[PDB]
């Protein structure tokens, strides 16, 4: 978007995120807020109403006290693989927790960038009523659920392909126009979701 709604949604957020006490990269947690940014207003707007914080978090997420109680759990889908709660680093739904430093596909999770797919969580069930498991959604993504690959996760859970195709949607316009040609009706919908 442009740089002035850019600076006005960096202003709400910052009504929103919570930064660490623990030493981190501050210019790679700036650029985490920078992409939040490009989230329409009104869902950062709405996200502050209900006093949702977005926890940037300087080490694992199991090393937060609110989450110690994760330490050593082993994920839905995760089992034979080694790894835990421990790894994974991020969540989102009734709260936001964020490693800095881990946005890209592949730094511990599957997603196209963390903060806009856990975040896309929180405003699934906190501003849009769980809009994800709408009617409406489910005929869109039994049709376009499997086209941004995982098949057997994003195709699977319409709550994650909401966050993915949300995440898709507002990252930047490469994956923007990506998502309008896979997944038409995803987009459509999302489109006047923001109208
Ligand atoms: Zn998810």
């Known amino acids: 978007m442009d740089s002035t709604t850019i600076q006005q949604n960096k202003d709400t957020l910052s009504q929103i995120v919570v930064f660490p006490t623990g030493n981190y990269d501050k210019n790679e947690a700036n650029a985490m807020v920078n992409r939040l940014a490009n989230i329409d207003g009104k869902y ?16 694992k997420l199991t090393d937060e006290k609110e989450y110690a109680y994760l330490k050593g759990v082993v994920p839905r889908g995760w089992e034979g693989t080694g790894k835990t709660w421990d ?4 969540l989102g739904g009734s709260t936001v927790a964020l490693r800095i430093g881990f946005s890209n596909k592949g730094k511990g999770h599957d997603a196209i960038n963390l903060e806009l797919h856990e975040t896309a969580h929180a405003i699934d069930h906190i501003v849009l009523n769980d809009i994800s498991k709408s009617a409406q959604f489910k005929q869109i993504f039994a049709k376009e659920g499997r086209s941004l690959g995982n098949v057997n996760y994003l195709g699977v859970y319409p709550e994650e392909f909401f966050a993915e195709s949300f995440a898709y949607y507002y990252l930047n316009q490469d994956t923007n126009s990506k998502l309008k040609s896979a997944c038409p009706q995803t987009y459509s919908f999302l489109q006047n979701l923001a109208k």
Not at 45 to 50: C, E, H, P, R, S
Request: no cysteine; charged share 20%; aromatic share 0%.
């Open 87 to 90: 790894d994974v680093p991020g």
């Open 44 to 59: 950062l707007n709405a996200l502050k109403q209900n006093n949702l914080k977005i926890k940037l978090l300087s080490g």
